[PDB]
Structure formats: structure tokens, C-alpha cells
Amino acid sequence: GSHMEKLAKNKVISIDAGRKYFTLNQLKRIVDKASELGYSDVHLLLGNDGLRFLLDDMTITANGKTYASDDVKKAIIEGTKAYYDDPNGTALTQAEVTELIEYAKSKDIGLIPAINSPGHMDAMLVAMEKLGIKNPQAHFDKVSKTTMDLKNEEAMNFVKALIGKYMDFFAGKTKIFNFGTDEYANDATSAQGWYYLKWYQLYGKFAEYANTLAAMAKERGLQPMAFNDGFYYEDKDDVQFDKDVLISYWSKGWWGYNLASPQYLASKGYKFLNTNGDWYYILGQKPEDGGGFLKKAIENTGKTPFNQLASTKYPEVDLPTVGSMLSIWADRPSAEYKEEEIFELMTAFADHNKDYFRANYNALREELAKIPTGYSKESLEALDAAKTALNYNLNRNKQAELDTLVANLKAALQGK
Ligand SMILES: C[C@H]1N[C@@H]2[C@@H](O)[C@H](O)[C@@H](CO)O[C@@H]2S1
Ligand SMILES: [Mg+2]
Ligand SMILES: [Mg+2]
Ligand SMILES: [Mg+2]
Ligand SMILES: [Mg+2]
Q1: CB atoms within 10 A of CB 384
Q2: Where do the segments described as Catalytic domain 2 lie?
Q3: Where are the alpha helices (DSSP H) in 136-247?
Q4: Statement to judge: residues 144 and 282 lie in one domain
Q5: Is the CB of 183 under 6 A from ligand 1?
Q6: Which residue of 43, 193, 265, 378 is most buried, as measured by CB atoms within 10 A?
Q7: Which range marks the domain in which residue 251 is found?
Q8: Total domains present in the chain
Q9: Alpha carbon of 141 to ligand 1 centroid (Å)
């Protein structure tokens, strides 16, 4: 819409730091580049197959017992290493993530944490076995290595408590919490998890789980977010879902995976974070592999409109979104993370959408930091003038405009 509305939208870079380890410094550099290019948020998966975040206190109370903090940490490290024993590291610490959140805040970048369940939770499943919780895995064509059995109360109680502890930490630090719910038991059903849930009359139980996670988020002052997969599958509403969840919409699925259309979810009142699959890059994916390789993602930042929801033609279909999310995935977590690839993709998305993205405010912030905490009244009026002239509302089309403003502040400070 208007200048104001476009800049009000979220522009998100998503990083799969669940499957693959990222150091605090790597994530800080991603925050840096996000701020420079005019993004508003970094979406950070911390639970996604691997579980790569440990709180200082991981004491868990569930099932009428307590699991000691040291036992929980040990079990999670085991689970994550079992998924993929990343040579770069295992888990981020509470101090590291606190530091990341604060660093992002200083640059007007939000953090959006994701801890995935009941799918994409390999590490949690093994962790639960280590803690004496037998058979946490769903069991269809085979025993799943990724997905929790909704009928296992002991495991369900534990995971809810675990997610609550993470939510407790993010409460008052982040606006949004993404509980995921994508791709239920894909590994055990030939990617037909929702069909299998329905077959076994467990889709109502899946809704109950998602509805609970959504209430948990809201209760702790977090906007709940989830991927679209499990919501109103096949545009049916015999089973109801919480209407306050922000939907990260990425795909309407494929043959035999009949996800609800964005039109149908819009009719149910959902708002969307446009997480179009067209923009995906999977680390190490090459043109010969098909799917989300870098050249395709980069090309799509131009071809797929900012507001275009997957499975729809924009503006012919124009559904309300709060903004858009470009996603970096680590399906094969041993693939090398090459920061410049991610930066080029991030830059392409911003360059194709200069009206949505902010200008680069880093030079300005550095310059304001030089303001001395007994000068001429003439030299002061000028510093006040240049300061008053600063414009914090500029988009990426107006970098030269901003640079001039900053230069005037530089001169006034040096003409002190
Ligand atoms: C919601 C996300 N679910 C899947 C994700 O785990 C994959 O990494 C990605 C790339 O294969 O594709 C989809 S998007
Ligand atoms: Mg088996
Ligand atoms: Mg309904
Ligand atoms: Mg995307
Ligand atoms: Mg690497």
C-alpha cells in the first residue's frame, strides 16, 4: 500500500540452525547484513530435527516427576548428535542467544525463534528415550525417526513442558514464537502424514496439540506462529484450529499432500507471513538436483512478487499478509554454509523490493555514537539542526538521500 504500510511489513530471513550448527558470530553477521539490507527480523529455527539451544536451567516437570537439568541437557546433546554430530558445534547457550537478541535489538531487528514439534523433532525423541520415556515415536509404515506419537501421553506431556520452558525464556524478549507443525511423520508415510492422521482418526488429536501450543504462546505474551501444513487440511473444517496463529504459508503441497489453500485459510480469518517456497535455498543444492538451488532462489526473488502466496497468482489473488520470509534450509546439514551465498540471496530479495525494505541505518548509528556526552552555541545549533534533519523512515530506494543527511551530521560533529 502506502510508503508507511510497506515499511510496516515484516521482511524476514529464516535460518535453519536446527539441523545445522551456527556460531553466535555467524548469526550476528546474518543480523548485520539483515539490518544493512533493511530486513525487520531474523527467523531462527533452534528446534528442527536437531535441537541446538540449551537454557541454563533445563529442569523439566512432567508426568508427576521431575527430570534434572543436567540429565535433560545430556539427553538433548545425545539426541542432537544422533541426528547429526556437527563438527562445528552442538547447541547455542542461553548467554549466546540472549546476546544475539540484544545485538539484533540494537539494530532494530527482531528475533523469531522456532522450536519444531510434533514433526521435525528427531533430537527430542532420542532425548526422551535417554530420560526413560519409551517409544515416543509415531509408528506408521515404519517407526518414525522424526515425529512424536500423539497417543503417547508421557512423551506429549514432556514435550509440552519442554516447549513451555523455551517459551518462558523468549517471553518478553521476542514478539513471536513459531511452534512449527509442518510435515507430520513424512519419513514414515511417504510424505502423507496428514492422510495417515485422518486414516487413524488422529487428526483431531493433532489439532488439540497445536491448539495447546497456541494457547501456551499467547498466555506468555507471545504471538503464536506455525507453518500452514496441518491447518484445515484439504479445506475441511470438521476439526477446528486456533484462529490467532500467524500462518507461515509456504506451499499448498503436491500430489497426495492436499494442504489447505491460502484462500481457504484467509476465509477462516488467518493472517500470513508469506514464506513462499519459490525463495528457498537448501545449503549445497545444485542446479542438477532440482528444487531450491541458489540460482533458482535468486531468480525467483524477481519473478515471484513480494505479496504472492504460494499456489496463487498475484495480484489476481490478493490475500492479506503481514510481510514475507525468505528461508535458508539445511536438509543436508553437512553441506558447507557459505555466508556470501546467503548474503547474495538476501540482497537480491531486497533489491527487487526496495519499497518494502528499509534504507541502511548502520552508518547513521555509528555517527550518533560519536556524539560527545562547553562548546560554542553556534557549533551546537548546527549539530542540533543536522540531528533534527535525520529521517528514520527511508526505504532502500533512498540510500543516497540518507547518506547526505548522515554526512551533514558528520560535518556538524567535526565542526564542533
Ligand atoms: C516448513 C518447511 N518444511 C520443509 C523444511 O523442513 C525443508 O528444510 C524445506 C526444504 O526442503 O522444505 C520444507 S519448508
Ligand atoms: Mg520400523
Ligand atoms: Mg472453524
Ligand atoms: Mg521463503
Ligand atoms: Mg559449514
Answers
A1: 11
A2: 5-416
A3: 153-170, 193-199, 203-219
A4: yes
A5: yes
A6: 193
A7: 1-357
A8: 2
A9: 21
